[PDB]
Design a protein around this ligand. Structure first.
Ligand SMILES: CC(=O)N[C@@H](CCCNC(N)=O)C(=O)O
Ligand SMILES: CC(=O)N[C@@H](CCCNC(N)=O)C(=O)O
Ligand SMILES: CC(=O)N[C@@H](CCCNC(N)=O)C(=O)O
Lengths: 334, 334, 334
């Protein structure tokens, strides 16, 4: 059974095929690839774009999305094995995935880390459990990685430069400020796809404490060696932005401070200057800027940057619809 | 770009065309006017009829509605310009409207005032912001006016009297009791459409403190002068109801007490006799009664009035479906 | 007007016809029985399977389900007659049912008891009120009985034994532990359908305090006398399980302790051994086991029992989809 948990699990040929189908769907949006089929969108956290794009995607392909929010409308789920379920959880994922598998053709899952302990969050328990027990394909709608965002992002870049081959371009993945520590998911994903695409990637962040989990630094390394691009970690803003072709911003809390954010708060506040403004963007090679959204203006990026013709954030957001339809079409087959 | 923010922005010919299309949809409910199209229903407040009628309307015309509730499932939105988004809001309407505009063909918005300060609530910031940033038509699902209710109401009246021309009929818009101060939206709308339709309108309320915002009193005046009807404010129940052809009730808090309801509470409680009962209705010319719903029985209207053959509230509620389908059909064109 | 409030209101012929149509829908899932039609799914409590199965059912038959949650997205409803609505409730069921009746073709309702006083909960006020005021068929999605579960359960049993005639089989409806007192709905329903099907039923529970409401004990008696099966109450585990063909577990709070659960808590805790394990199941005649779900593993049933080839819980859960489509098809006719 083939799932869409991470682009890293797919071959370059398969990913290129997904991106091409995405481009095709963008030209002809209505289809019958999901005629009479259905997808269960399981959200453990908030969403606007994700719920909307998947729901519309299913509709445009003749299918139907059922939106579920455990703990909200659906019942809370247990993932640990062998435990005595006498707590808050009402049913086990083993039953949840099997039942849904009798109803729907696809299951999408969004579940952010709990932020109590990265040791457990990095295990991707919810996602892996769905994939394990589900008799139908599972799609990652964002957990500790955000593969759908990777392809929406990649497609937007290919559309911007007018070519699928992004090798040679200087890609800057920069950390940005936010009054709170966030998931590293989008950052992990950006690093993964930018390298897989063979670009010269620079992970710009304040201190070594903000470097991403080794798992992804390693995927990136393997990606570079096989793509022809390069990987580099930087802590100097100006040297990073210099001659960049793409600037992708994202904020996240330092992994070393998981479950103990009290002390990291004063640490992030000292770098609220990492904000992407006209000044920094002026250092790039007429580079494009984007963010996965939602974005806090004048905090992560300035109004001027967000409104510049170089900002492709809206295009990337739109592409979520097309890339997800490509993913759902690829996973079904009945 | 044409939106449906208020009936006052539309010409009488356009409104008559909407009402006629509504009547046509009521005769033939299934159609293809929205085939493959979609509408994003953004609810900032509660709804049963509105969400249901729009959702079914989209379905019956071959389209699909995506229901969104910011702060609930979607992310909280910022509307003020240039501010440093370091508060509760996660993203700006500029991004929200632009992204939705890449997904859907129409955007409906429901956002009640905050009731903290009428000076800001009367600016209709949420609605206006959607219309400003959205690349697709925006529909008012109730903010400080309720235009969809106006047309549902108007159609019901035309169906009751068996004619589109309501000129000559005596229309009584009466305030009614409610343990809490409410939005003036429906009242503002009732006054607007009743005058636009050329009826002899009487705004019956307890004291001059319950008179509606000048904006609407003025729209009404302009409407009367151009329709041939009349406008009058009254504080005497019996003189108002006398010879009335239509009685539309609605409760609302005194604008002069916005943000300071503590003292107005004892004021409204002294007029809990404004309730629409058989006695008052017996003073009318075999007049019809209606309320926009939801209605608290034995508080706003008595069980006897609600169950009388003269009450057309259920018909008006039904018409919300037909009028909204007419509105969505008029706004799309692709 | 025909509703689906309880299987007990239907003749055996009608129920057999429903089960047969369910079997037919399971073979050919897509149809046009609900083409252009719609159902309003009103949930006063949580749901995953129910909302999903009904929503998908409507979709597969060419219709559309509108999901509503009063107090959540829709407005809170009043059911008592003649009262002065100056409390929390915003509108009366009389208006709610009539309005929905102008929009949809079917109305499903899920409303659990309040657990404050069984005298009032057993009156089934919400369900009965919808049926009373609705101009369209009403479907019980679980209140104090769970008829849709009965048919899903019955069909699964018929599929297991390869025959619609379950007469002769030994059926054991056993109480099971749960850290909290639950609704007796599923138990009441299991007892009702097992007897209606003519099986030899044994109501196994800890003490006479856990015996179900007389209403259902009596339905069961009437059912046995007319079906050829039998009814028996037991408090001894081993004697009950012995030679059983079917074991259906469900936990519920003692009716005599409604509104006063403080003292029953220590009572249930003394019987946490009623858990369905391999030991008890080994006492049966190669019997099948099932639960309505959601189920707390190692509390209501052991992991070994839930994973045994004899557990048909997933099949029963799947059947909810097919039986409900049969029910909706039977109730519509336009
Ligand atoms: C602010 C916050 O928690 N953001 C989330 C992402 C929101 C979803 N975005 C998307 N494009 O799908 C984060 O990962 O930090
Ligand atoms: C009680 C309350 O807040 N009511 C709202 C209206 C509810 C929506 N009605 C409708 N018909 O769309 C009010 O404007 O006072
Ligand atoms: C735990 C709890 O409250 N359960 C509910 C039932 C949940 C719905 N199940 C179903 N199969 O439709 C009960 O009746 O006890």
């Amino acid at each position: 059974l083939k799932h869409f948990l991470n682009t890293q699990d797919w071959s370059r040929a398969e990913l290129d095929a997904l991106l091409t189908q995405a481009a095709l769907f963008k030209r002809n949006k209505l289809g019958s690839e999901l005629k009479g089929k259905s997808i269960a969108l399981v959200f453990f956290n908030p969403s606007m774009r994700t719920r909307t794009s998947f729901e519309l995607g299913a509709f445009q392909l003749g299918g139907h999305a059922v939106v579920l929010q455990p703990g909200k409308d659906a019942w809370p789920i247990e993932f640990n094995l062998g435990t005595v379920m006498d707590g808050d959880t009402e049913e086990h994922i083993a039953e949840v995935a099997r039942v849904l598998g009798r109803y729907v053709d696809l299951i999408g899952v969004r579940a952010f880390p709990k932020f109590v302990d990265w040791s457990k969050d990095r295990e991707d328990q919810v996602l892996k459990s769905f994939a394990k027990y589900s008799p139908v394909p599972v799609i990652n709608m964002e957990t500790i990685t955000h593969p759908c965002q990777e392809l929406a992002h990649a497609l937007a870049l290919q559309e911007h430069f007018g070519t699928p081959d992004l090798r040679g371009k200087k890609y800057v993945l920069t950390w940005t400020y936010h009054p709170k520590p966030l998931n590293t998911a989008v950052a992990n994903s950006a690093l993964t796809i930018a390298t897989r695409m063979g670009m010269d990637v620079t992970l710009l962040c304040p201190t070594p404490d903000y470097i991403l989990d080794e798992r992804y630094m390693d995927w990136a390394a393997q990606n570079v060696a096989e793509s022809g691009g390069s990987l580099q970690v930087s802590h100097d803003i100006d040297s990073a932005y210099a001659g960049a072709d793409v600037v992708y911003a994202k904020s996240w809390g330092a992994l070393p401070f998981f479950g103990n954010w009290e002390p990291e708060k004063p640490i992030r506040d000292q770098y609220q200057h990492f904000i992407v403004d006209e000044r920094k963007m002026a250092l790039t090679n007429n580079g494009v800027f984007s963010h996965c959204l939602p974005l806090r203006r004048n905090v992560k990026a300035t109004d001027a940057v967000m409104d510049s013709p170089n900002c492709i954030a809206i295009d990337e957001a739109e592409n979520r619809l097309h890339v997800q339809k490509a993913i759902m079409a690829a996973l079904v087959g009945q």
